[PDB]
Amino acid sequence: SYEMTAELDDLTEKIRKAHQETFPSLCQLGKYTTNSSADHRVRLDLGLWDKFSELATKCIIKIVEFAKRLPGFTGLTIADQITLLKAACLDILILRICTRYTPEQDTMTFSDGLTLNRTQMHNAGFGPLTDLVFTFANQLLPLEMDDTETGLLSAICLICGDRQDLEEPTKVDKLQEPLLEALKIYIRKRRPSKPHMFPKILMKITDLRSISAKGAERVITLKMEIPGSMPPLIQEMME
Amino acid sequence: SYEMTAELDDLTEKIRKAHQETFPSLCQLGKYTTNSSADHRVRLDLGLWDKFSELATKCIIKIVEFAKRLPGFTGLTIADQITLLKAACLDILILRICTRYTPEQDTMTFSDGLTLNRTQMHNAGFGPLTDLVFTFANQLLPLEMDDTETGLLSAICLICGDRQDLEEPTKVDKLQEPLLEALKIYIRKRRPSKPHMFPKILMKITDLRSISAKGAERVITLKMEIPGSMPPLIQEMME
Amino acid sequence: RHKILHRLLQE
Amino acid sequence: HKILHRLLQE
Ligand SMILES: O=C(O)c1ccc(NC(=O)c2ccc3cccc(-c4ccccc4)c3c2)cc1
Ligand SMILES: O=C(O)c1ccc(NC(=O)c2ccc3cccc(-c4ccccc4)c3c2)cc1
């Protein structure tokens, strides 16, 4: 029914703790809604945008923290740490907010409890990407991932040795390798029936990539609508 | 004879064949070059575009015949068959051309034999996306994929249940599953040495979706730079 | 309202 | 980068 996978379960545990401690679970938050432009869609709600861009800044900070938790990541040179972060960041921003989707209310919750409906996500700065991101959220539900699988996935995404301008890409590959076998196994243990789940979940990174690509272009357009300037951290990550 | 083993060897074969018979091998192509804008890089070579766009169109036609050869594909709805084609057409265009890359000469070879260098490819229409497409072509050789791997990988792009506006996402989804299993089984049959080669090859679709996302954005840019309309079929696939 | 792809599908 | 450097160097 299984076997020993010792020093891979310990790694798996490191990833779950790293994730949970940097990303409060949905059920564990004090939700609160807002009244601002909840009725109809608009180009950009300066009010909603203000809080959103701040929660984005904060989530980025937690992401960097999650990275430094991943064994070996700090071992990579600063340049390669930055290269990896800058490439996967948006992919994970997407992943996180989507695991905060409430199917029935059709909303999303941030780490401060703030819970916006589809239309408010649009006005917060999602624009044309709204329906696309929300579609992805609904595609995740039927998989019923847990914090372990979500953390492992975000890790596989960040620790990718195919990024451009990377100095020790095989050092990165080596680090990613176990994260893959760790996931492969954990899914087999967490599920004794549906056996085609490793691939299905694994190539959801593929889905993230599409959205992250179209996402960067949204981020370019946004600077054309914004009162002043992009949060320095956001610009630093999107260059 | 074990059942699923048998059925998957069947699927694997039909797809390999459907790939060989719809896409010639780089080794069985009689190459030939041209001197049009071959030395320096310009905004657009109307001459190269016309020929590139003609060969792409015929590849699309080729790609359509490939889909029709995929087990279950003509069992989907016509909206869905159409939808899947339009959403994976560019993914496969990229994949197909990137397996026709020659490292020593830094060139790519179409189906009629035409062989354009990196500069000519740009002048043909790749524009600012040129190097991105070539880099991906480099990161494909070390895998030395064959008709079967490239074929299954194309069928996975084509039979994707997460594509938007699908009438029967679940049917399309269950249809992708056997493919994912065949790829895993085959990849392991080929290289029982390198064991982690399944997720590596499989996740090349991550690159596809990113390049494809930017390709779509590029196509729109071409649409205003070309003194005429793109071929009718390309128009349709890019809607 | 292109009519090519469908014709190709039909064969 | 000013921020990433700091945040990373810790
Ligand atoms: O737990 C939180 O509080 C939290 C979770 C996810 C996020 N996610 C994002 O900020 C995010 C998610 C998806 C996105 C998709 C497309 C574009 C952006 C975006 C990023 C930076 C500036 C503007 C838009 C996106 C930004 C923010 C905060
Ligand atoms: O053997 C053939 O005949 C053949 C193989 C691949 C292709 N590939 C493409 O046409 C192709 C490949 C990559 C692309 C990346 C970005 C944009 C386009 C593109 C597609 C349609 C119109 C303009 C650009 C791309 C188009 C064409 C012909």
Numbering used by the authors:
A (entry chain B), B (entry chain A): 170 to 408
C (entry chain G): 629 to 639
D (entry chain C): 630 to 639
The authors write:
Importantly, the novel compound BMS948 acted as a full RARβ-agonist at 1 μM, whereas a very weak activity was seen with RARα and RARγ. In contrast with BMS641, BMS948 harbors an amide linker. In contrast to RARα, and because of the presence of an alanine residue in RARβ H3 instead of Ser232 in RARα, the carbonyl moiety of the amide linker of BMS948 and BMS411 points toward RARβ A225. This flipping by 180° of the amide bond induces a change in the position of the rings B and C of BMS948 and BMS411 as compared to that of Am580 and BMS614 in RARα. Interestingly, the only difference between BMS411, which retains a significant interaction capacity with RARα, and the RARβ-selective BMS948 resides in the replacement of a dimethyl-cyclohexenyl ring by a planar phenyl group. Whereas the two methyl groups of BMS411 are involved in strong van der Waals interactions with LBP residues in both receptor subtypes, the lack of such chemical groups in BMS948 results respectively in a modest and strong loss of van der Waals contacts between this ligand and LBP residues in RARβ and RARα. Indeed, in the absence of the two methyl groups, the carbon atom at position 5 of the BMS948 naphthalene ring remains involved in several contacts with RARβ LBP residues whereas no interaction distance below 4.6 Å is observed in RARα. Thus the divergent binding modes of BMS948 in the two receptor subtypes bring the naphthalene ring into a LBP environment that is more sensitive to the loss of the methyl groups in RARα than in RARβ, in full agreement with the much higher affinity of BMS948 for RARβ. A superposition of the BMS948-bound RARβ LBD structure with that of RARγ bound to the selective ligand BMS961 shows that, as in the case of BMS641, the position of BMS948 is incompatible with the presence of Met272 in RARγ.
